[PDB]
Design a protein around this ligand. Structure first.
Ligand SMILES: [Mg+2]
Length: 365
């Protein structure tokens, strides 16, 4: 049986070659993927596809991300020193680092290989694209799944190789209904009940039908969703605040900001809150609560990908759960998105990445 292989490649900001003590994660990950691609395609029967991801799919199309904090009414502002306060979404053309069609055409394969990234965005480089450097694992897995489901067949052996250095910091929302009396726990159980083994949630019960920036949970801040909606002062315990300069007071007042004696007190934007919550009164669920991006990603995986029988291998790079997951949560998570528990390996050395990919390829061929 010929092989149809999707490589999923993390190009998050944390992969930038200067990070983790100059260990060159993007370079080494990129070359490992390149070598894997050559090894797979030396059999003419085998096809390959490439999905590079961070906050979105890097496929050369335009994407939008939401950022910033908010006042007590959820009115968004960017408190960064590098951006005007109105700059609460970014819209940019992504790098073309993906090849979304399974191919065994030699010319096409070389095009795929030429799109493999060897670097990630730098905080002092392209600061707009840097906004797109978070970790939206579910979207990437959805894309790899979409390629195989639409382009492969029941007659072909299907593999995913996933190279990542971080737990998800964004997720698609589970579609809880706030306007019925059924508890959020009962609604969640009804979602599970649609899968034979009760272990996951079908794509149809996620909010998918709209632009990511409007509908996704998380903005790269954390693996966790926050129960305390107040932004703390870094190095205090008290709630952070944005001090309105004198010449911006009337404008910010007219814009509608909640200004209290010259200060706007700072809250996480509501895509970063524990959910579900009542959309009008803001009251959080008193039963089922989603508190991490790992949970919905794993529920998505079990409901929609895991039944399909693929071999899915995951190579982590210095994975420790940052930001917001414990090392144990991160490990279980990465295994939960691999087709077997032993199909996840976490390296502490970027020079071992290819060898772990090869090891996994060797169990197949
Ligand atoms: Mg990362």
């Amino acid at each position: 049986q010929p092989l149809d292989v999707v490589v999923l490649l993390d190009n998050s900001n944390s992969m930038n070659n200067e990070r983790a003590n100059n260990s060159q994660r993007a370079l080494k990950a990129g070359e490992a993927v390149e070598k894997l691609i050559d090894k797979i395609t030396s059999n003419k029967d085998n096809r390959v596809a490439l999905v590079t991801y961070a906050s979105t799919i890097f496929d050369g199309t335009e994407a939008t991300v939401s950022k910033g904090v908010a006042d007590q009414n959820g009115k968004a502002l960017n408190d960064s020193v590098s951006w005007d306060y109105h700059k609460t979404t970014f819209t940019a053309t992504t790098h073309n680092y993906s090849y979304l069609n399974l191919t065994n055409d030699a010319n096409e394969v070389n095009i795929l290989k030429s799109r493999i990234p060897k670097e990630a965005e730098h905080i002092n480089g392209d600061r707009t694209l840097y906004q797109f450097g978070a970790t939206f694992t579910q979207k990437a897995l959805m894309k790899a799944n979409e390629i195989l489901e639409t382009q492969s067949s029941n007659a072909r052996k299907k593999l995913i190789f996933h190279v990542t250095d971080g737990v998800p910091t964004m997720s698609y929302a589970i579609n809880f209904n706030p306007y019925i009396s059924t508890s959020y726990q009962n609604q969640f159980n009804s979602f599970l009940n649609k899968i034979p083994d009760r272990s996951g949630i079908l794509q149809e019960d996620f909010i998918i039908n709209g632009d990511d920036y409007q509908i996704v949970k998380g903005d790269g801040e954390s693996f966790k969703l926050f129960s305390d909606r107040k932004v703390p002062v870094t190095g205090g315990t008290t709630q952070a605040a944005y001090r309105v300069p004198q010449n911006q007071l009337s404008v910010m007042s007219n814009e509608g900001y909640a200004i209290n004696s010259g200060y706007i007190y700072l809250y996480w934007r509501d895509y970063n809150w524990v959910y579900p919550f009542d959309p009008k009164t803001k009251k959080v669920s008193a039963t089922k609560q989603i508190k991490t991006h790992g949970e919905p990603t794993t529920l998505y995986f079990n409901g929609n990908i895991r039944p399909k029988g693929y071999d899915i291998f995951t190579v982590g790079i210095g994975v420790n759960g940052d930001p917001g997951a414990t090392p144990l949560e991160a490990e279980k998570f990465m295994q939960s998105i691999s087709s077997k528990t032993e199909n996840y390996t976490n390296v502490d050395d970027t020079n071992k990445i290819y060898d772990e990919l090869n090891k996994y390829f060797k169990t197949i061929v």
